[PDB]
Amino acid sequence: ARLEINVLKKIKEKFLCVLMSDAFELLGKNTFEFLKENNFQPYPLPHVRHMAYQLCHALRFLHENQLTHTDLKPENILFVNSEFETLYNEEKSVKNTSIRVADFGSATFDHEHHTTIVATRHYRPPEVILELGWAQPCDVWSIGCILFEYYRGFTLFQTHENREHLVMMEKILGPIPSHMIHRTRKQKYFYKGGLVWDENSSDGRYVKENCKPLKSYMLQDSLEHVQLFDLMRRMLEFDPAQRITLAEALLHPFFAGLTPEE
């Protein structure tokens, strides 16, 4: 099943992706390894900004060429060089914050058959869970979750099951748009428009204690933090038709803080 090779060849011909030589180039540790190798202490905002910029550029490229990745997660984003400079206050900070997007094994073309369920759970969007169909906006959702993870050090949706996941989504982002609820065949999750959920269950207890409205995860109050969260909340729009595109995301005030080298 090296129809992966095919995608890689189609991609090369059109580029912050890890692509083929014939296997490919070796790079540094991935952005999750680095997180774990640093106690899950977040990346500082400037790193998060440069990484976000690169991600949006990388996938805007796929997205404008009839491709969705479907499996973006911190494990598939690679530092070109993960050499770091430890500093006491001990936290680690990577030297060169350039990244590459990897693993096009799941990348799907517009015209290809779309499997119902795609993405790794924590990075999977509501349209997929509710089986409303999916395309490029899938990746944008994943990118929102990933940026949050870079900025706080922990997963946005640390979940194991659909119902819980949906409850976490409402907890953090507000209620699911009613039209999406009317449209899904997955009605077993709902009653009179409301997610069926026992708050006294162990998971229900986890969510009450640990999931809160998105803005409340802001570490600092500076403009740059406010903008990152404005951009994240647009990437984590429930409705894929209304969710921001990566072309649009790059025209966001958040990226004003980039160096011109960056």
Give the phi and the psi of residue 104 in degrees, each rounded to 5.
-90, 15
What is the Cα–Cα distance from 250 to 180, expressed in whole angstroms? 27
What is the Cα–Cα distance from 189 to 223, expressed in whole angstroms? 38
What are the structure tokens assigned to 106, written together? Answer: 């799941």
What are the residues whose beta carbons fall under 8 Å from the beta carbon of 235, sequence distance 6 or more? 140, 141, 143, 144, 147, 243, 244, 249
User: How many CB atoms neighbour CB 160 within 10 A?
Assistant: 10
What is the Cα–Cα distance from 239 to 233, expressed in whole angstroms? 12
Resolution attained, angstroms: 2.3
CA proximity to 51, closest of 120, 123, 147, 139: 147
Breaks (C-N over 2.5 A) in the chain follow: 14, 22, 89
Please name each of the domains of the chain with its CATH number. 1-262 (1.10.510.10)
What is the Cα–Cα distance from 172 to 213, expressed in whole angstroms? 4
User: How many CB atoms neighbour CB 134 within 10 A?
Assistant: 24
71 a catalytic residue: yes
Q: At what angle do helices 137-152 and 223-235 cross, to 10 degrees?
A: 140
CA proximity to 241, closest of 170, 157, 182, 177: 177
What is the Cα–Cα distance from 190 to 95, expressed in whole angstroms? 48
What are the residues whose beta carbons fall under 8 Å from the beta carbon of 161, sequence distance 6 or more? 203
Question: Of 71, 103, 198, 221, which residue is the catalytic one?
Answer: 71
CA 120 to chain centre: 10
What are the structure tokens assigned to 121, written together? Answer: 């759970």
What is the Cα–Cα distance from 244 to 228, expressed in whole angstroms? 14
